[PDB]
Symmetry: C4
């Protein structure tokens, strides 16, 4: 595995984004296989002070191709909100600042079972969101499988 997330580190939280290509991976001598669907994976972690973050407390939100399209389609005055009920319930919000200078990206996680509620917010500048739209656009066909790695091409 190569890791190359695009990461943004801010006051209350950090956000890392990275494509997940569809894959089927053997481990444990072949007894177990890990099947991953194509997505754009967003990972949030909370700040703990002195400019550091708690990796062990990270929470994720996986964007489908359609959800990626939602983000790519946003201009400076647009919003997106996504709800995943995979009893853990997650909400991702991308909301623009009034001056068009960027967005708050937040993730809300509700665990009815453990009675917990977690919230992570990261501001993203216009420049940072431009990186996301460009990189996400690049990655989208690959997450959809439109290539030689996943496509059945010789």
């Amino acid at each position: 595995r190569l890791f190359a997330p695009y990461s943004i580190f801010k006051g209350k939280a950090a956000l890392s984004v990275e494509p997940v290509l569809p894959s089927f991976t053997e481990i444990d001598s072949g007894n177990l296989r890990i099947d991953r669907r194509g997505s754009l994976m967003m990972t949030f972690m909370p700040a703990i002070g002195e400019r550091k973050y708690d990796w062990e407390k990270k929470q994720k939100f996986a964007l489908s191709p359609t959800e990626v399209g939602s983000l790519i389609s946003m201009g400076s005055k647009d919003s997106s909100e996504f709800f995943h009920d995979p009893q853990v319930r997650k909400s991702l919000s991308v909301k623009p600042h009034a001056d068009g200078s960027g967005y708050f990206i937040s993730l809300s996680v509700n665990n009815s079972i453990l009675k917990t509620n977690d919230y992570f917010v990261v501001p993203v500048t216009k420049a940072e969101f431009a990186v996301m739209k460009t990189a996400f656009s690049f990655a989208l066909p690959h997450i959809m499988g439109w290539n030689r790695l996943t496509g059945h091409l010789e």
Copy 2:
């Protein structure tokens, strides 16, 4: 084979996937025949809630120029493509509020005297996937990759 991008709606479903250029050699072979790519749209009618009839699927292949038409569409634009002679046409018409489009396929069989209309709403997000995927595919279907 590529996994299609599919949209499943109330009355019909739409799937889209690229078809690469293919080549064959003839005349010994002094002629190389290069078959242009397309973006293939496949429509199926609903038979229940989120159920569709695969046996009744209908295809519409977009040329590079027709793909250009779609990628160039803003939130207030329309496109309509006519293929003939069976006779088919494809329209992309915007919702007044700018939140998406209807993408609709008309199929007229003159043999059997039927006219079938497959209508699929597409959200802004879903059309953005198409525009991005199609823009990616366009150089490949043109043979510029």
Copy 3:
């Protein structure tokens, strides 16, 4: 071939476009640099009749990366015009929009000698066709700049 030309065939002329990659030369230290720049080669040829074109009369115009930039950045109300001059004669290429925003007309002017009337080849290009051009040209731009070689 590496690039199959995109062609548009219309009433008075036809237009074909294809990338030409840059050449490299090794210099000192085993290092390689661009020798001759890449371009987007546009080939125009006039109509002789009913969708038939005179290939013997083809004329070419090589767009530089910067000129390709000019085209890709055009909106529906913009025009572009490029003038080339130091075997090679003076040529100019223009892209002008129809007032209704439905598309453009692309014109190549070839200035011949004082004994020879100039040649003018004009090809209308619809919004859809120009979208194919901008998309394909954007794709080709880093290749004609040699940037694809700076990566995988």
Copy 4:
């Protein structure tokens, strides 16, 4: 190894731009991570009269992916300004002409150690900036290492 800058030569200076890829290094368990970040390298040099430039007095400014995003997202009336500390202070500005015909791109280098400073200004046309935006957009996922993820 192979060099392929996009270069703009103007009255007072020239600008060359070129991507620099990240490097990936193996860690534990066969996994690879980025040990050197990618950038978009901007190289400025001074005009020395005639139509020539002092290729040996070049000065550089390395844009991060985020700084590349700043430029890609600029419209004809937008500005960008970046401040770097590698004291050697450097600032890069991209400021629009009022008529929307292009920009000035300038590099300021404040050399506190040598107690000097340099200044390069390169006008860029709309077309030239469009090349930059398109080429930078192409290069961005490569400088971020995402081409390696997607294969």
